[PDB]
Amino acid sequence: GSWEIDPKDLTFLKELGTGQFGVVKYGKWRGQYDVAIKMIKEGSMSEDEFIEEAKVMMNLSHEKLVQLYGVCTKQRPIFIITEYMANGCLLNYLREMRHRFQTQQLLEMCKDVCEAMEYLESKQFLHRDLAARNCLVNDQGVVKVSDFGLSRYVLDDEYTSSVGSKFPVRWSPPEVLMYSKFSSKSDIWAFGVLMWEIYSLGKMPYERFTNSETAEHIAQGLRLYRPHLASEKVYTIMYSCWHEKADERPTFKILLSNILDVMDEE
């Protein structure tokens, strides 16, 4: 009935880990509904800017998005209440079950993310930090996209600056690195890297390079190799995401149609 949640309705049960804004806890809303509670660390977020734009994020609704339930702002620290995902982040899930993953399950993961991204693209809403660490897995093995657009409110120069140690260089196209030009085509690039993370079973992209060496090699035309579990058709799809020219990259609508074609073929 309102996006402002009463913190007295929340029960804190277990710490889930730490994100870009600090501690995130698992809990219950009104003792029944499972929730993730982000406890926004002091000085980690542009809180006023986030609160002013929160309603747009609140209205984003799709089955493949980790839902934003509401906020607790009449306090300090503020809370962000989200959908809880029982299997945690995709990156750790891939690493934990690595040699038990089948190619059909890997394709299904790509499809789930692609559907979420096709929806964000239709809303002209940028994720800005799409990667396996920012995708979550529910109890049914469904992959959902998490923390879309939250990148904009980070107060941490190491993360927001392209020359910073926490900036997601390995998921960034050249126009983001050089010109800070974010678009649905920069999310396309990150999605290609994410497909590679899925098919490589959670390997770090360009592991033999530093962040600076990655940016340099990519600018010179180097691309991620075909993972062992990726077929020629799967590699063609992820590779199409890495066109040097943003306008020559496919849309998420085109990517989804290509993923469904591979699914129907196998």
Ligand X SMILES: *CCC(=O)N(C)CCOc1c(N)ncnc1-c1cc(F)cc(NC(=O)c2ccc(C3CC3)cc2F)c1C
Query: Cβ 166 to Na ion, closest distance in Å?
Result: 33
CB 198 within 8 A of CB 132: yes
Which residues ranging from 204 to 263 are in contact with Na ion (CB under 5 A)?
228
Q: Which of 137, 162, 13, 20 is nearest to 85 (CA)?
A: 137
Q: Toward Na ion, which CB reaches closer, 166 or 226?
A: 226
Question: Binding marks (x or -) toward ligand X, 36..75, rule CB under 6 A?
Answer: x-x-------------------------------------
Which of these segments, 43-51, 98-106, 132-140, 206-214, binds ligand X (CB under 6 A)?
132-140
Among 47, 115, 129, 187, binds ligand X (CB under 6 A): 129
Binds ligand X by CB under 6 A, chosen from 82, 186, 211, 214: 82
Q: Taking CB within 5 to 8 Å according to partner kind, which of ligand X, Na ion, none is near residue 172?
A: none
Instruction: Choose the one of ligand X, Na ion, none that binds residue 211, judging by a C-beta under 5 to 8 angstroms depending on kind.
Output: none
Residue 145: other Cβ atoms inside 10 A? 26
Find the binder of ligand X among 11, 44, 67, 92 (CB under 6 A): 92
Considering only 130, 150, 194, 230, the residue that binds ligand X (CB under 6 A) is: 150
* Pairing status of strand 22-29 against strand 79-83: unpaired
H-helix or E-strand spanning residue 136: strand 135-137
Binding-site sequence positions for ATP:
16-24, 38
The answer to the question of residue 29 lying near ligand X (CB under 6 A) is no
Which residue of this chain has its Cβ atom nearest to ligand X in the complex?
A: 19
List all residues 6 or more positions away from 159 whose beta carbon is below 8 Å from its beta carbon.
Answer: 20, 166, 167
Q: How far apart are CA 11 and CA 102, in angstroms?
A: 38
Question: Binding site membership: which residues?
Answer: 16-24, 38, 82-85, 150
- β-pair type (10-19, 22-29): antiparallel
- Measure CA of the first residue to CA of the last residue in the chain; give whole Å: 45
Q: Are 115 and 65 in contact (CB under 8 A)?
A: no
DSSP 2-48: -SB--GGGEEEEEEEEEETTEEEEEEEETTTEEEEEEE--TTSB-HH
Report the catalytic residues: 129
- Which residues line the annotated binding site for clofedanol? 82-85, 150
Nearer to ligand X, 89 or 218 (CB): 89
CB 44: neighbour CB atoms within 10 A?
17
Which residue stretch of 57-65, 131-139, 204-212, 213-221 sits at the interface with ligand X (rule: CB under 6 A)?
131-139
**CB-wise, 24 or 106, nearer to ligand X?**
24
Identify residues after which the chain is interrupted (C–N over 2.5 A).
none
> Which residues sit at the interface with ligand X, rule CB under 6 A?
16-21, 24, 36, 38, 82, 84-85, 88-89, 91-92, 129, 133-134, 136, 146-147, 150-151, 154
> Which residues sit at the interface with Na ion, rule CB under 5 A?
228
